[PDB]
């Protein structure tokens, strides 16, 4: 959009600073919980600062990176947007139910989403975007076939590419999708945003049908909602146990957060991890917990998408076999516990193991792939078919 000099990275800073000084207002009394402006802006600043150090003398090649150009433009537009939110909102900023106030919360979400995206692309401050690893592999294969190593694509370019595989049947449906997937609200789709959405909406094969069933037609789906908002909304239902809703989790993006009312009248919030949303919704209904979406007596039947095309089997190779024999065992077997065949694939890294060991590792407050220790963004169940 425009080239990034250090006068500009300067201008953003001054602007972020104003937005902070506004939000420090004693009359505002923002709740400290994610997303939280008084964390997000400083932390974004910190991270930017970190990227700048890394690019010293290389400022030429950083200024020319398209993702970064798009980020700094959106970041400026958004802060500016926030600053004039206050300006026009006047005192209506302090009425917690005020529309200005809800827009400010929408903005908190976005700032959060932007920082996560930024950390994703520049994890240590160094630009990884071209190497970014998409969690789900069918999703990965799509992006790579269509977009190469591009970190970011215009919305219309994304819409056209995707439509070729998963047909979007209309303009309205296209708008709904853009609004769901464009988390930073910049009219672009990052490889990062692609990751979040494909994780949220897996499996890839039924990704549009999935998204239709879980968001478009579903009374329980809440877009751009906050943990605190989810709590408030379910308050009206505290007397109807089984009432539930769900939303993107902001502190772990690409994971779902389900709020629900309990037999005794408490509002609790849970994250299914590694487990696809529908199964959770299906089990939760069957088991009595998730009953009346957003309070409604009618609960959708998701058994429709319960029948996914099965992931294939990996099929050990003559090469592999002879190797694992000279090692003394079978490739097929989980090299962690040593008593099981590998039933699960860690994503994005690809490493194979048994679910028991995966579960025990996670429950042990251990983190990331026990092998390469990269973060576990996804799991795909599998079966290995040995060479013999």
């Amino acid at each position: 959009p425009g080239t990034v000099d250090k006068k500009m990275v300067e201008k953003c800073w001054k602007l972020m600073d104003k937005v902070v000084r506004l939000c420090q207002n004693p009359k505002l009394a923002l709740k400290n919980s994610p997303p939280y402006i008084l964390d997000l802006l400083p932390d974004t600043y910190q991270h930017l600062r970190t990227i700048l150090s890394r690019y010293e003398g290389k400022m030429e090649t950083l200024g020319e990176n398209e993702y970064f150009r798009v980020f700094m433009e959106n970041l400026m537009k958004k802060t500016k947007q926030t600053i004039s939110l206050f300006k026009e909102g006047k005192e209506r900023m302090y009425e917690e139910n005020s529309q200005p106030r809800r827009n400010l919360t929408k903005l908190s979400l976005i700032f959060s989403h932007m920082l996560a995206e930024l950390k994703g692309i520049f994890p240590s401050g160094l630009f990884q975007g071209d190497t970014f690893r998409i969690t789900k592999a069918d999703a990965a294969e799509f992006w790579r076939k269509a977009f190469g190593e591009k970190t970011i694509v215009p919305w219309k370019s994304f819409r056209q590419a995707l439509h070729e595989v998963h047909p979007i049947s209309s303009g309205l449906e296209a708008m709904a999708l853009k609004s769901t997937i464009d988390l930073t609200c910049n009219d672009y789709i990052s490889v990062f945003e692609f990751d979040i959405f494909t994780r949220l909406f897996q499996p890839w094969s039924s990704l549009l049908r999935n998204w239709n069933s879980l968001a478009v037609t579903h009374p329980g789906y809440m877009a751009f909602l906050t943990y605190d908002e989810v709590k408030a909304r379910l308050q009206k239902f505290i007397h109807k146990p089984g009432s539930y809703i769900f939303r993107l989790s902001c502190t772990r993006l690409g994971q779902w957060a389900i709020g629900y009312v309990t037999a005794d009248g408490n509002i609790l919030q849970t994250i299914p991890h590694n487990k696809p949303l529908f199964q959770a919704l299906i089990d939760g209904f069957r088991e009595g917990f998730y009953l009346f979406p957003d309070g409604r007596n009618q609960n959708p039947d998701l058994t429709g998408l319960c029948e996914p095309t099965p992931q294939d089997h990996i099929k050990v190779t003559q090469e592999q076999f002879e190797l694992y024999c000279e090692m003394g065992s079978t490739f097929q077997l989980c090299k962690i516990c040593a008593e099981n065949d590998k039933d699960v694939k860690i994503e994005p890294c690809g490493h194979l193991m048994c679910t028991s060991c995966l579960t025990s590792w996670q429950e042990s407050e251990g983190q990331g792939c026990p092998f390469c220790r990269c973060e576990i963004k996804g799991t795909e169940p599998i079966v290995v078919d040995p060479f013999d």
């Binding site: 943990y227 989790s249 919030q269 994250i271 917990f289």
Partner: peptide, 9 residues
């Protein structure tokens, strides 16, 4: 202590 509890059983 992030606000999130374990899944209902």
């Amino acid at each position: 202590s992030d606000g999130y509890t374990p899944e209902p059983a």
